[PDB]
Amino acid sequence: PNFSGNWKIIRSENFEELLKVLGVNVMLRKIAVAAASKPAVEIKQEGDTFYIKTSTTVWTTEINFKVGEEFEEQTVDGRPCKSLVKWESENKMVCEQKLLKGEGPKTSWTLELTNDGELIETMTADDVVCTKVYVRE
């Protein structure tokens, strides 16, 4: 039950479809699904506190959060939001998001550490669920 690691993605499903629901430019949608754009994910967890760094070819972003305390981040398409993470079970957390301005699809994400050492991420926009799977490196 410690999410800490350097995680490499091995499986993705429905990501392009998620970006389409979010209104992302098709130009970026095709780029985003390219093997080149795969995100490296670094997580450091201590207690209820999480540090997560995501890196791609030209972008690196960091978020810090504590379970139960509201924080600000961005939706997958980059719109600022307020987020609140809570546990669903011993090994899975769930985050609900609220836009800071304007309106758009209802977005959320989950992270789950399996008993076989994989990290499963889901990201949802309205009715579309994208699922990603990572392993430690």
Which one of the spans 32-40, 64-72, 84-92, 110-118 is the region binding ligand LSR (CB under 6 A)?
32-40
Strand partners, 135: 8
Query: Which residues are 52's β-sheet partners?
Result: 43, 63
Neighbours of 125 (CB within 10 A): 24
Please tell me the number of Cα atoms within 13 Å of 71 on its side-chain side: 17
25 touches ligand LSR (CB under 6 A): no
Minimum distance, C-beta of residue 104 to ligand LSR, in the bound complex (Å): 17
The neighbour count for residue 132, using CB atoms within 10 Å, is 21
Q: How far is the CB of 102 from ligand LSR (least distance, A)?
A: 20
Binding mask 91-110 for ligand LSR (x = CB under 6 A): --------------------
Three-class SS of residue 32?
helix
Site residues for ligand LSR per CB under 6 A: 15, 32, 37, 39, 54, 56, 59, 132
